Design a protein around this motif. Structure first.
Motif, short mmCIF file in Angstrom:
data_model
loop_
_atom_site.label_atom_id
_atom_site.label_comp_id
_atom_site.label_asym_id
_atom_site.label_seq_id
_atom_site.Cartn_x
_atom_site.Cartn_y
_atom_site.Cartn_z
N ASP A 59 -4.32 7.55 4.54
CA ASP A 59 -5.20 6.98 3.52
C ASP A 59 -5.87 8.09 2.72
O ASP A 59 -7.09 8.08 2.52
CB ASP A 59 -6.26 6.07 4.17
CG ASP A 59 -5.66 4.76 4.67
OD1 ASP A 59 -4.46 4.44 4.44
OD2 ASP A 59 -6.42 4.04 5.37
N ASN A 110 -3.20 4.89 -2.63
CA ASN A 110 -3.75 6.01 -1.84
C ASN A 110 -2.63 7.05 -1.71
O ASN A 110 -1.67 6.98 -2.48
CB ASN A 110 -4.27 5.57 -0.48
CG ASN A 110 -3.17 4.90 0.43
OD1 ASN A 110 -1.97 4.97 0.17
ND2 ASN A 110 -3.63 4.24 1.49
N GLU A 116 0.86 -1.19 0.00
CA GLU A 116 0.00 0.00 0.00
C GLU A 116 0.89 1.23 0.00
O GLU A 116 1.86 1.29 0.76
CB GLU A 116 -0.89 0.04 1.28
CG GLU A 116 -1.66 1.35 1.37
CD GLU A 116 -2.69 1.33 2.55
OE1 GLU A 116 -3.43 0.36 2.64
OE2 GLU A 116 -2.78 2.30 3.30
N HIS A 160 1.68 2.89 3.36
CA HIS A 160 2.32 2.09 4.40
C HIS A 160 3.82 2.10 4.24
O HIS A 160 4.55 2.25 5.23
CB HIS A 160 1.81 0.65 4.39
CG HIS A 160 0.38 0.59 4.82
ND1 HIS A 160 -0.35 -0.58 4.83
CD2 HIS A 160 -0.48 1.58 5.18
CE1 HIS A 160 -1.60 -0.30 5.19
NE2 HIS A 160 -1.70 1.00 5.43
N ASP A 199 -1.37 6.72 9.57
CA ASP A 199 -1.80 6.27 8.23
C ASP A 199 -2.96 7.15 7.78
O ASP A 199 -4.07 7.04 8.32
CB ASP A 199 -2.17 4.78 8.37
CG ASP A 199 -2.62 4.08 7.04
OD1 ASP A 199 -2.03 4.31 5.96
OD2 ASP A 199 -3.52 3.23 7.12
#
Ligand SMILES: [Mg+2]
Ligand SMILES: [Mg+2]
Ligand SMILES: [Mg+2]
Ligand SMILES: [Mg+2]
Ligand SMILES: [Mg+2]
Ligand SMILES: [Mg+2]
Ligand SMILES: [Mg+2]
Ligand SMILES: [Mg+2]
Lengths: 386, 386, 386, 386
Positions: free
Chosen positions: C256, C246, C216, C219, C254
């Motif tokens: 997002d 994202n 991700e 991350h 995080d």
């Protein structure tokens, strides 16, 4: 097509294009540049002016005679090209004597020497026409907790800046000081590590009006902070005297990439702010052409600094002029943020039952802020998709 | 053996031991604690007092009648236990109406509501005997650049704090304000993100003497900054009104670990500084027992906060009292850092040829600072190997 | 103008547009969305499909009868819209029983329960046509060092994935697993914290060919790592089974953000890589519309995810097709990087005096890499200035 | 009192105590040390051995004749002192020819040269008795996205390591390789940036059994990662061939502080793990005495490395031997983590109704993990308060 002219007020340090590429793990990859040839090449690229540390221009240890000859040659290249010198600064970090600092070294004789070295260059700066004198206290700090009593160190830092302010006022010089914060590197932690800490410190000096800040993009990003927010606070306080523009990819060693590299969206919001607040000082690039590059890459990197500023300026101006963005700003109540909360005063606020007893908290909470649509319009403008 | 007493001035927020363990990815793991039972259990552990947000004590939406009953029960537990309430604060972050901020929300009616909600709790705080009123602007900030004009937001923030200062002075209250900085979370970037930014902002308020800072260990460490250095600058400015003690492992989400966890050596240097500067305010723990724990682990975690403070206090005192350390401090010239650089004045400095023309720069540079020996003595003391 | 179609393979989690806006400091700002209405709205926006955790679709605690009714309604909306379900996953993080992990919880009975809960959803995923089953071990980790023996925990993690691989092969299912790394949050440190750690772990499983990674963007950026580099290593190993797109602004909680926000230049290089390597899996957005937004902002944010992907795809394609860029790539010797160092073999290399004894090290060192000109061409393409 | 002996297997790089103190902003503060005098002084302090880069021992550019004389003198000091050489490595980062890398430089002739330079030193390492050959690819990486196609670069990196493995096996040498990861500095991003990425890469080499990792405390902490967790994963995989011990204060430039400085609690958990797993390789210090120090501070800093290891070893051993800690470990179910989840097998798990249909999820969720009490016992042991 995004061609700079001296009216854009782009300036460069001698130490930027002149960086030889020595890093902590490697030898120089480029030969030294003569300051005269840097001035000439920067003028051809459209720069407005150059800045210097004392030791960039006059080799450390020079006799007064060699010193005069170095300044004369420099002066002649400025006359030949029309380049200005809007800012100067002192090198209080390279020589081993400064290993524990200049103004806040534990040894008192080093602190005195640091002050005399600074004062000598202030005289030269004034003679070359500089309006701002920058101080970056790169060695002021510590690797361990017992090495530096920070309250005593801040007393010594205030003492040094107060003396410099007494010096310029007693000489009648029209020059102001700008403190450049950095959180770490080369010391484990550096004193006055962010814009905020520097602004707070200035308010305790004897003549605060003489001192402002010289923030650098990459330095605030080394603490993970939002650089346009920090600049906004410096403008709000009336203290943005100068600025160092470059790029940085996040929290790591100080990369000093060309401006526009690193965090591109932060560069866009920075340019939007500087242009919309009417900042009129130099657009100074404190950057290092990577040591992968030869001299052709050095000048390409310098040109890229200016190019990216001008592209972002165009995109930010188009964003603010777009009627659809102006509509979205009202949809997100930016107009209401600019209006006083309580110009009616405290007592009126306390008596206003619509502010509390009869305030409909669920209806206010349901209102969307429409920030995502606004931010996508900003993205579309940045990318030229509008 | 490291047993706290109320004279150590350890305090806890109701929201700390009362945290139910809801995090962004998970439901509560513990049931809600009655504030009365938190007061009783904390008093048994040796705490001095508790702090509260308005909404910790009085459920949001309570009628004035339920409000009186909640305060009476709380008041009775304080009388029963001898616990004090030295600080209080406002919840301007949980309810959805505060999703874009309280004092700097774009909607003007929300800003007015935020002020009225604050003023209501200042009255209650004064009635319970609090001396400090904390403001943590957790929702003041932005996720995107166009959502918040930061200069206008700082105008609204100054307006709100100025009105609160007008309110307390016109009521004759003996209470001072403390701003608690945090760099991010829950907003992408929070306004006044560090101790430095908060100190600078205070100097622009109408009555700066009413305002100080409430720094939190973990918050400055979320920007990678040195927390004892930041506290030293706050003490230097005379602005350390309160402090939040906890632990944090580096740059990530706000962990709020028990004090002593996280960066242990920074905790040692913090305690050394607070005790050696004679800080006399509350030692307040803003921490969250991890959601792995049941109620027995909650009280063990709270007890650990106080225990670790007292162990570090003993080790820091032994360090400073050790003749061998006092010798090492002189070897590293900490005594010389505390002496003025130029009490003889500017003109004497300019005439002093030993400061520049005859300064032996190579001999000064060769002097070692002996900082590593000093830091190993500090390590030996911390570990009880001395 | 940058309009998505189902052929672009854009997918969204039910939990993304359905996020109610609960964060660690605040209540929900939006009402819950029915999964059927999310499917319908996403199909109107041009999405290809949706993904789910078991507990997004079937409320935890449902009887088998309510479970069938929830799946039937969902199935009908898929048929009505043409939406696909390419991926599914298990919620092993929200319920309090998972507070110390699922597969690596210290309690053995919880680990067994975690496996049974997973296997139940694998059956459902296969029935809905999913090709990839993601595992995000968000609670696998620790806040303190003694709580988790990591070697034993990795044994338990391998045991769990080996059993899942035995289950799918004995059932004859055509589904593969993808591990989603994250370095921290909600645990202090999470096991398998980066793409690299996950790739290494897979090589110790009994049937490594069944397992890949689901990286991700945000991350890997929470560890300050270069996300396109990590994706390149996953493609090199043949393990990029799925991807979560994202945005993230640096090292913090995080966020997002919608794709394209955060690090924009990294998004450009990511799209360039995925398109030039011919990645053919879903373009999945794991993002959270900020809690400032109402439902109109939710759909605007989702639309922005897809829009920014398509704009960057166009700019990356124009970059690679530009003859001037192709020239610059040869100037920087990207062609030579793709050629073997020593296809002539070890002995030929050892005998080749031009490789060492007669190698002109100063002439090679003087060659510039021309990387800055290449990077400015990439900037010009990204900004539409070419 | 914490006195090292050669049986503790403490080793130091020649480049550590020999660091002259050149950093990116400053000149050397110490004169160069003769390798012979470093060997003698380290032996007096109780070290077991030393390590070297080729260019630390033999000045770059030396003729074969000067090379023999440098090795003979070194060999004699080893014989005189009893010091061993357990590890050696190649300098592929200082000379300008390596500005874009060694094994992954875009220029093919540089890659060939890098391999020949490495092979020459492998022969010397074997002759001096080294068992491990370290590779730190400090220049392998990029500052910009288009400069390096990472898949091609990983092909070139695999090609280089495969050739080195062919060389050692065809010569019959008993030496193994260890890759040392680092996330960044001096390149903007370095390839194989963490332990995990290096472990994954090794599994794609032709003879993986020849290759392991050489993790360094500070390097994993530059990515904010948990270093004891990463070491646990390397031990789990059987790949911890060597280790570099030092200290680092968080995410910033690579500080290389003496071991025990930086994150002290992580140092405690690291020592606990290495001793409890029976790691039997060298305890190697890759550290830099700060440039504030003279030569007396250099040796004090080196001595401190070893001292802090031995103090932490004693505290970790006392922790694990304490009956009260052994009780707490069972209270937190560390014993249950070490037991298989499902040694009864898949079908038994699927039939076990106590694992799902009859599992009491609320009763399991209510169980506290007692991790905070366990962690305070660990703190008390570390601080000598037990
Ligand atoms: Mg910089
Ligand atoms: Mg600068
Ligand atoms: Mg906190
Ligand atoms: Mg706090
Ligand atoms: Mg995420
Ligand atoms: Mg995800
Ligand atoms: Mg290092
Ligand atoms: Mg190393």
């Amino acid at each position: 097509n995004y061609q700079p002219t001296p009216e854009d007020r782009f300036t460069f340090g001698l130490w930027t294009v002149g960086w030889q590429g020595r890093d902590p793990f490697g030898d120089a990859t480029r030969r030294a540049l003569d300051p005269v040839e840097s001035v000439r090449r920067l003028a051809e690229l459209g720069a407005h002016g150059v800045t210097f540390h004392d030791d960039d221009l006059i080799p450390f240890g020079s006799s007064d005679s060699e010193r005069e000859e170095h300044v004369k040659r420099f002066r002649q290249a400025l006359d030949d090209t029309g380049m200005k010198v809007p800012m100067a600064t002192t090198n209080l970090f390279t020589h081993p004597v400064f290993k524990d600092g200049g103004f806040t070294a534990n040894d008192r004789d080093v602190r005195r020497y640091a002050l005399r070295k600074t004062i000598r260059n202030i005289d030269l700066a004034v003679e070359l026409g500089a309006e701002t004198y920058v101080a970056w206290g790169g060695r002021e700090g510590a690797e361990s907790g017992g090495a530096k009593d920070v309250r005593d160190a801040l007393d010594r830092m205030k003492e040094a800046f107060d003396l410099l302010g007494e010096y310029v006022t007693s000489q009648g010089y029209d020059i102001r000081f700008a403190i450049e914060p950095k959180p770490n590197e080369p010391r484990g932690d550096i004193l006055l590590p962010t814009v905020g800490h520097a602004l707070a410190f200035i308010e305790r000096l004897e003549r605060p009006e003489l001192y402002g800040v010289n923030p650098e993009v990459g330095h605030e990003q080394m603490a993970g902070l939002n650089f346009p927010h920090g600049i906004a606070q410096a403008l709000w306080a009336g203290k943005l005297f100068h600025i160092d523009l470059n790029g940085q990819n996040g929290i790591k060693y100080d990369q000093d990439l060309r401006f526009g590299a690193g965090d591109l969206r932060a560069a866009f919001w920075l340019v939007d702010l500087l242009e919309s607040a009417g900042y009129s000082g130099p657009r100074h690039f404190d950057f290092k052409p990577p040591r992968t590059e030869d001299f052709d890459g050095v000048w390409a990197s310098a040109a890229g600094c200016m190019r990216n500023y001008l592209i972002l300026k165009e995109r930010a101006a188009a964003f603010r002029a777009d009627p659809e963005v102006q509509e979205a700003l009202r949809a997100s109540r930016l107009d209401e943020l600019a209006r006083p909360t309580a110009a009616d005063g405290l007592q009126a606020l306390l008596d206003d039952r619509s502010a509390f007893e009869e305030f409909d908290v669920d209806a206010a909470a349901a209102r969307g802020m429409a920030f995502e649509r606004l931010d996508q319009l900003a993205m579309d403008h940045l990318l030229g998709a509008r």
